[PDB]
A = this chain, B = another copy of it.
Amino acid sequence: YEHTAVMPNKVGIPYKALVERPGYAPVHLQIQLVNTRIIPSTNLEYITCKYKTKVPSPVVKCCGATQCTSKPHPDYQCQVFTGVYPFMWGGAYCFCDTENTQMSEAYVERSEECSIDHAKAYKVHTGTVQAMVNITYGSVSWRSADVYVNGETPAKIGDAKLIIGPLSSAWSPFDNKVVVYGHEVYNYDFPEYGTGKAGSFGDLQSRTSTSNDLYANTNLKLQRPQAGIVHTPFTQAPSGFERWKRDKGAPLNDVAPFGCSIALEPLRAENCAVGSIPISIDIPDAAFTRISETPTVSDLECKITECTYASDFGGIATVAYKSSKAGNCPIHSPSGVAVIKENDVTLAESGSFTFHFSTANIHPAFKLQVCTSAVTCKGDCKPPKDHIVDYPAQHTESFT
């Protein structure tokens, strides 16, 4: 009843296996993986965005110098100039000709746009993956269970209880350093907090949008106003966050192999088809029925009808059933050569019922198990010319 089985990690591929429960009628299983969310553990480092040089009003003493003070503003650049003669609309501003001094100061403050648009640095750990599994086994034909991958957690939705994982591959598309920009994910190597070079990425680094303190290395340097005019000419490197926005690499959600996609989320990488899962499930004995009730289908034979050497269910075959009583009968092929989309067939008195399947061998010689009745369906297949189908469901490529 406790059917342990390793399962390939695919999303849209069934796992219709058969339970070889002694003393009772065998019961088919069926497992599907809707999602394979990874959700690695993450730790935010800092957020960067365009900055705004909030330059306050200059201090202009008409006759006399004025020493500046080292204010605690981030990247607070202050410098005093000498020998200035500012004009304004109302005429010349002072009667002195050399004692005029200007005290110009400027500091970098994060732009108002940071509230909505801002990159996010992230350092990630291994984390723990989760999956949504649908199991339509036996006669219940339904399940809607969210499960983990750790090799301890039971999942007991409906009547059956089972345990999943751990994954065979520790492959994580995320790197140790991950940069998230609004909706797309880039595995860019942000240097560290409080060390960004001016002009490059992370010129302005804030711990959090709420955090008041930040790290603004913009190489801001004021210069003398020209021709006696009241303003604050400041020379600084162009916004580093503006750069790398128009020349960033391909997002990780567009270069991650194994068909894995990401989202603005706990950063799960869903549908990351890789490795296998050691699935173990405990079927309740209630679903089991006495073996003495299943009709006998011995002395039957299998005939191939038309097999296509393709990926979709192009293979069909007719089975000449030789039964005694009437009832349901699970069908399954223990061999991985062929996969049968058909799940249950009712048996009449010496009837014949076609079924569909798919295979990957030119001359498929696969065992067919029919409610405790073995038969080999040997035949021939033909490759298709119009290779236009859904994604392959045979998942059995090997030597042919």
Task: Report which of B2, B22, B314 forms a contact with A22, defined as CB distance below 8 A.
Answer: B314
Q: How far is the CB of A386 from chain B (nearest CB, A)?
A: 5
For residue A384, CB closer than 8 A to chain B, the reply is yes
- Stoichiometry, copies per complex: 2
For residue A156, CB closer than 8 A to chain B, the reply is no
For residue A394, CB closer than 8 A to chain B, the reply is no
Residues of B within 8 A of A314 (CB): 22-23
What is the chain B residue whose CB lies nearest that of A20?
B382
For residue A290, CB closer than 8 A to chain B, the reply is no
What is the chain B residue whose CB lies nearest that of A356?
B23
Residues of B within 8 A of A359 (CB): none
For residue A353, CB closer than 8 A to chain B, the reply is no
What is the chain B residue whose CB lies nearest that of A315?
B23
Identify the interface centre among A23, A306, A312, A314: most chain B CB within 10 Å of its CB.
Answer: A23
Task: Report which of B306, B307, B385 forms a contact with A2, defined as CB distance below 8 A.
Answer: B385
For residue A308, CB closer than 8 A to chain B, the reply is yes
Decide if A384 touches B23 in the complex (CB within 8 Å). yes
The DSSP consensus for interface residues of chain A is loop
Residues of B within 8 A of A244 (CB): none
Residues of B within 8 A of A306 (CB): 22-23
Q: How far is the CB of A314 from chain B (nearest CB, A)?
A: 4
Residues of chain A in range 4-35 having any CB-CB distance to chain B below 8 Å: 21-23
Residues of B within 8 A of A87 (CB): none
Residues of B within 8 A of A310 (CB): 22-23
Decide if A23 touches B308 in the complex (CB within 8 Å). yes
Decide if B308 touches A1 in the complex (CB within 8 Å). no
**How does the 8 Å CB contact mask read for A299-336 relative to B, with 1 for contact and 0 for none?**
00000001110101010000000000000000000000
What is the chain B residue whose CB lies nearest that of A24?
B306
Residues of chain A in range 383-397 having any CB-CB distance to chain B below 8 Å: 384-386
Residues of chain A in range 243-272 having any CB-CB distance to chain B below 8 Å: none
Residues of B within 8 A of A2 (CB): 385
Give the docked Cα–Cα distance between A22 and B1 (Å): 41
Residues of B within 8 A of A1 (CB): 385-386
What is the chain B residue whose CB lies nearest that of A385?
B1
Residues of B within 8 A of A308 (CB): 22-23
**How does the 8 Å CB contact mask read for A219-236 relative to B, with 1 for contact and 0 for none?**
000000000000000000
Residues of chain A in range 40-89 having any CB-CB distance to chain B below 8 Å: none
Q: How far is the CB of A4 from chain B (nearest CB, A)?
A: 11
Residues of B within 8 A of A382 (CB): 22
Q: How far is the CB of A26 from chain B (nearest CB, A)?
A: 10
Q: How far is the CB of A357 from chain B (nearest CB, A)?
A: 12
**How does the 8 Å CB contact mask read for A365-386 relative to B, with 1 for contact and 0 for none?**
0000000000000000010111
What is the chain B residue whose CB lies nearest that of A313?
B23
Identify the interface centre among A1, A21, A22, A385: most chain B CB within 10 Å of its CB.
Answer: A22
Residues of B within 8 A of A21 (CB): 385-386
Q: How far is the CB of A363 from chain B (nearest CB, A)?
A: 15
What is the chain B residue whose CB lies nearest that of A316?
B23
Residues of B within 8 A of A384 (CB): 22-23
What is the chain B residue whose CB lies nearest that of A2?
B385
Q: A residues touching B (Cβ–Cβ < 8 Å)?
A: 1-2, 21-23, 306-308, 310, 312, 314, 382, 384-386
> Could you give 9 example pairs across A and B, Cβ below 8 Å?
A1-B386, A21-B385, A21-B386, A22-B310, A22-B314, A22-B382, A23-B306, A23-B308, A23-B384
16 additional contacts (CB under 8 A) given A22-B308, A23-B306: A1-B385, A1-B386, A2-B385, A21-B385, A21-B386, A22-B306, A22-B307, A22-B310, A22-B314, A22-B382, A22-B384, A23-B308, A23-B310, A23-B312, A23-B314, A23-B384
The 6 lowest CB-CB distance pairs between A and B, nearest first, are A22-B308, A23-B314, A22-B382, A23-B308, A1-B386, A1-B385
